[PDB]
Amino acid sequence: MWIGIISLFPEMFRAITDYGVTGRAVKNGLLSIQSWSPRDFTHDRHRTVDDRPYGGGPGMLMMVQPLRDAIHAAKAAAGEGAKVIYLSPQGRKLDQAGVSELATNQKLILVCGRYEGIDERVIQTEIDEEWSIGDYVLSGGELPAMTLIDSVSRFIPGVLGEGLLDCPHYTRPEVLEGMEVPPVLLSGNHAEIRRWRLKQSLGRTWLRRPELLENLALTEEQARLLAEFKTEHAQ
Numbered sequence: 001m002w003i004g005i006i007s008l009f010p011e012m013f014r015a016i017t018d019y020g021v022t023g024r025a026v027k028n029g030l031l032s033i034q035s036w037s038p039r040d041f042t043h044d045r046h047r048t049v050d051d052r053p054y055g056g057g058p059g060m061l062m063m064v065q066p067l068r069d070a071i072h073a074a075k076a077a078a079g080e081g082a083k084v085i086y087l088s089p090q091g092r093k094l095d096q097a098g099v100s101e102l103a104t105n106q107k108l109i110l111v112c113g114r115y116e117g118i119d120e121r122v123i124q125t126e127i128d129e130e131w132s133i134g135d136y137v138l139s140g141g142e143l144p145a146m147t148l149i150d151s152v153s154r155f156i157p158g159v160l161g162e163g164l165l166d167c168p169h170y171t172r173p174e175v176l177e178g179m180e181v182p183p184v185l186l187s188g189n190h191a192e193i194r195r196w197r198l199k200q201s202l203g204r205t206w207l208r209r210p211e212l213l214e215n216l217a218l219t220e221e222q223a224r225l226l227a228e229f230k231t232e233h234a235q
C-alpha cells in the first residue's frame with residue numbers, strides 16, 4: 001500500500017509515521033506515505049492558501065490553484081488507478097465494511113481540507129470519492145486521513161503480526177479490588193470460553209447498540225445465548 005497526502009500540515013502525519021503498528025509498517029515498507037502541501041504551490045508573497053467564498057459566508061475556503069497543483073503533483077507521482085479521496089463530513093460514513101473496500105486499493109491519494117472546505121468544482125474534477133469519519137465536525141482532514149490510514153493498514157498482511165461489539169477482556173491479577181476474572185477464562189475449556197465471549201458480545205451489543213442487532217441475522221445458538229443474557233440481566 002502506497003498513500004499520497006495533500007495537506008497544509010504534512011508534519012501532523014508523523015503521528016502515524018513514527019508510532020505503533022503504523023510506524024512499524026512504515027519502517028518495514030508495508031506502507032509508504034508522501035505528502036504534497038498546497039503551500040509549496042503558492043505564487044504570491046504571502047503564500048496564500050485560503051480564499052473567500054462566493055455568496056458570503058463564515059469562513060474561508062482553500063484557494064483553488066495551490067490546491068489543484070498539489071493534487072496534480074500527487075497524481076503525477078502515483079499514476080493510473082490511484083483512487084483520489086476527499087475527506088469530508090459530507091462523504092460516505094466510514095465503517096468496518098467500507099474500511100474493507102478501501103483496504104482493497106494499492107494506491108490512494110487523500111485530500112485534507114482546512115477552513116470551511118474546498119470548491120465544489122475541484123471535488124467534481126479532481127476527486128473519485130468523499131469519505132467521512134463520522135457525523136460530527138472537525139476543523140481539518142488530517143485526523144480523518146490518519147484515521148482512514150490507520151484502520152485500513154490493519155488489513156495489510158505484514159501489519160498486524162462481523163456485526164457485534166467485542167466482549168470484555170481480563171489480564172493479571174486474578175482479583176483486582178475484590179473483582180475476579182470470570183472463572184470460565186481461567187478453566188481451559190475452549191468452547192465454554194468461546195461461548196462466554198459470544199454471549200457477552202451479544203449482550204453488550206443489545207445493551208449499547210441495539211440497532212446493530214437488527215441488521216444481523218442471528219443463528220439459533222446466538223438467539224439462545226442472547227435470550228439467556230437478557231434473562232440473567234433482569235436479575
Ligand SMILES: Nc1ncnc2c1ncn2[C@@H]1O[C@H](CSCC[C@H](N)C(=O)O)[C@@H](O)[C@H]1O
Nearest residue numbers: 087088089113117132133138139140141144
Ligand atoms: N467528519 C469529518 N470527516 C472527514 N473530514 C472532516 C470531518 N470534519 C471535518 N473534516 C475535514 O476538515 C475540513 C473542515 S470542516 C468543513 C465543513 C464544511 N462545511 C464542509 O462542507 O466541508 C473539511 O474540508 C474536511 O476535509
